Amino acid sequence: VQIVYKPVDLSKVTSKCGSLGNIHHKPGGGQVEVKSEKLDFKDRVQSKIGSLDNITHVPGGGNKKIETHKLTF
Amino acid sequence: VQIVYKPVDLSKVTSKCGSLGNIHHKPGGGQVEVKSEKLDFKDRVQSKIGSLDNITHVPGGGNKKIETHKLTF
Amino acid sequence: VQIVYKPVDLSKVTSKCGSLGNIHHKPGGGQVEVKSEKLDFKDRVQSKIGSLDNITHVPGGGNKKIETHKLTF
Amino acid sequence: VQIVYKPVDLSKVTSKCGSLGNIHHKPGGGQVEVKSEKLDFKDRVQSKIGSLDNITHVPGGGNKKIETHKLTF
Amino acid sequence: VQIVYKPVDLSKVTSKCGSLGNIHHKPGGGQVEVKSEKLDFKDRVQSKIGSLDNITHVPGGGNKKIETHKLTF
Amino acid sequence: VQIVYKPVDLSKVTSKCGSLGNIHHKPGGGQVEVKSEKLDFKDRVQSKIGSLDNITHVPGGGNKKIETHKLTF
């Protein structure tokens, strides 16, 4: 048995941007009011209140090559 | 048996943008009011209140190449 | 048995951005008011209140190559 | 009279367990509210209220051999 | 008369357990409220209120041999 | 008369546990409120209130051999 596994790649993944900017992200500008009375928790509680986990992501290029080569005999 | 596995790939994935910008994202500009009375929880609670997990994502190029090569004998 | 595993890569993953900036991220500009009376917790509590885990991420290039080679006999 | 009582016993009672666990028992997570007004007992009273006599029993092996030998002459 | 009582035993009662754990027992997580007004008792009262007599029993082996030999003459 | 009473035992009652642990027992996590007004008892009263007589029992091996021999002549 001969197996020859010779995949060849000359690919390009490219971008050109003349400028990138003037980007505004303002989560949670409105007031948040939470009022709790006489509550009863008999098991686990997770509480998030306000402005959490918000992302601004502005990469000058966010290009991806994802590449898997697999041989199973 | 001979198996010759010789795929060749000269592809290009490309973008050009003259400029990118003036982008405005404003989640949760409105007020949030939560009033809770006499509630009773016999099991687990997850609570999110306000402005959470909002994404602004402005890649100057967001190009993707996804590529899988598989041989099973 | 011969297995010859000779994958060849000449790839490029690239970006050019002429300028990158004027990026604004303002989570939680609104007031957060949390008022609790007579609450009763009989198991674990996690509480986050205010402005937490917000990300600004502005890489001059955030390009990725991900490349996996596997041979199983 | 000759009586020979010679039962012979090479038996095995056996278990193998790869792992045992992740067992949750939560009796009485609901509230109990008892309101008694103007009751009249002319004899003995036994009252159990709440969470009583609850068993969790998790033996790593819970085998029984029960063996009775009786001779009546 | 000859009576020869000679039961011969080579029994085994056995377990092998790879691990035993992650056992949770939470009786009476709910509240108990007992309100008694104007009650009359002519005879004996036993009252149990709350979380009583609850058992967690986790033996790494719980094997029993129970073995009774009786001769009546 | 001859009575020979020669029961013979080579038995074993056995366990092997690779690890034992991570056992949690929390009786009476809920509050107990008892309010008694204008009650009248003409005989003995036993009252248990709160968290009483609760057992945790975790023996590394909790095997039993019970072996009873009786000859009645």
List beta partners, residue E51: D51, F51
Nearest to D9 among E5, E9, E44 (CB): E9
- Contacts for C32-35 with beta carbons within 8 Å, 24 or more apart? C32/A31, C32/A32, C32/A49, C32/A50, C32/A51, C32/B50, C33/A31, C33/A32, C33/A33, C33/A34, C34/A34, C34/A36, C34/A49, C35/A34, C35/A35, C35/A36
- How many CA atoms, within 13 angstroms, populate the side-chain half-sphere of residue E57? 14
* Contact present, D18 and E18 (Cβ < 8 Å): yes
DSSP code of A12? E
Cβ-defined contact of B56 to A2 (cutoff 8 Å): no
Cβ-defined contact of A40 to E29 (cutoff 8 Å): no
Strands E12-17 and E2-5: unpaired
CA distance D25 to E58: 13
CA distance A53 to B52: 6
End-to-end CA distance of chain B: 11
Closest chain F residue to E27 measured between Cα atoms?
F27
The label of the residue with tokens 């969470």 reads D51
Best of B52, B53, B66 to disrupt the A interface by mutation (most A CBs within 10 Å)?
B52
* Contact present, B47 and A39 (Cβ < 8 Å): no
CA distance D58 to E56: 8
- Which chains pack against F, by 3+ Cβ pairs within 8 A? C, D, E
At CA E45, angle to CA E43 and CA E49, rounded to 5? 165
List beta partners, residue D46: E46
Closest chain F residue to E8 measured between Cα atoms?
F8
* Contact present, E67 and D70 (Cβ < 8 Å): no
* Amino acid, res. B40: D
Nearest to B73 among A56, A58, A73 (CB): A73
Cβ-defined contact of F32 to D50 (cutoff 8 Å): yes
CA distance D40 to A66: 81
In terms of C-beta density within 10 A (0-12 exposed, 13-18 middle, 19 or more buried), how is residue C22 classed?
middle
For residue C47, CA distances in Å to A43, A47, B46, F22 come to 14, 5, 10, 26
Q: Which two tokens stand for residue A52?
A: 């959490």
* Amino acid, res. F70: K
CA distance F41 to F8: 60
Strands C40-41 and C20-25: unpaired
Closest chain A residue to C33 measured between Cα atoms?
A33
Q: Which two tokens stand for residue A64?
A: 């991806």
Q: Which residues make Cβ contacts (< 8 Å) with residue D6, sequence separation at least 6?
A: E4, E6, E7, E8
* Residue C31: alpha-carbon gap to chain centroid: 27
Closest chain C residue to F27 measured between Cα atoms?
C42
Buried b (16+ CB within 10 A) or exposed e, C31-61: ebebeeeeeeebbeeeebbebbebebebeeb
3-state class (DSSP) for residue C54: coil
List beta partners, residue C55: A55
In terms of C-beta density within 10 A (0-12 exposed, 13-18 middle, 19 or more buried), how is residue B42 classed?
middle
For residue B49, CA distances in Å to D14, D60, F11 come to 55, 45, 66
Strands A45-52 and B45-52: parallel
F65: nearest Cα among F7, F9, F18? F9
DSSP result, E39-59? -EESS-EEEEEEEES-EEE--
Q: Which two tokens stand for residue D61?
A: 């092996």
* Contact present, F30 and E29 (Cβ < 8 Å): yes
A41: nearest Cα among E17, D15, F31, C42? C42
* Contact present, C31 and A31 (Cβ < 8 Å): yes
Cβ-defined contact of C28 to B21 (cutoff 8 Å): no
End-to-end CA distance of chain A: 11
Cβ-defined contact of A43 to E31 (cutoff 8 Å): no
List beta partners, residue E24: D24, F24
DSSP code of D16? E
Question: Taking CB atoms and an 8 Å cutoff, what residues of chain D touch F62?
Answer: 59
CA distance D56 to E62: 14
Determine the distance in angstroms separating the CA of E2 from the nearest CA of chain F, rounded to an integer. Answer: 5
* Contact present, B39 and A40 (Cβ < 8 Å): yes
The label of the residue with tokens 């357990």 reads E17
B41: nearest Cα among A43, F28, A36, E32? A43
* Amino acid, res. D14: T
What approach was used to elucidate this structure? cryo-EM
Nearest to D60 among F17, F27, F30 (CB): F17
Tell me the helix, strand and coil percentages in chain D, rounded to 5.
0, 65, 35
Cβ-defined contact of D60 to E65 (cutoff 8 Å): no
CA distance B1 to B13: 37
Determine the distance in angstroms separating the CA of E63 from the nearest CA of chain D, rounded to an integer. Answer: 5
| Number of residues in chain C | 73
Q: Which two tokens stand for residue B25?
A: 């994202």
Buried b (16+ CB within 10 A) or exposed e, B4-33: ebeeeeeeebebebeebbebebbbbeeebe
Cβ-defined contact of C37 to A34 (cutoff 8 Å): no
For residue B53, CA distances in Å to B22, D60, F35 come to 22, 46, 48
Other C-beta atoms closer than 10 Å to the C-beta of E4 total 14
In terms of C-beta density within 10 A (0-12 exposed, 13-18 middle, 19 or more buried), how is residue B70 classed?
exposed
This structure's resolution (Å) is: 3.0
- How many CA atoms, within 13 angstroms, populate the side-chain half-sphere of residue D38? 0
F51: nearest Cα among D35, E35, E28? E28
CA distance B38 to A49: 20
The label of the residue with tokens 């007020």 reads B31
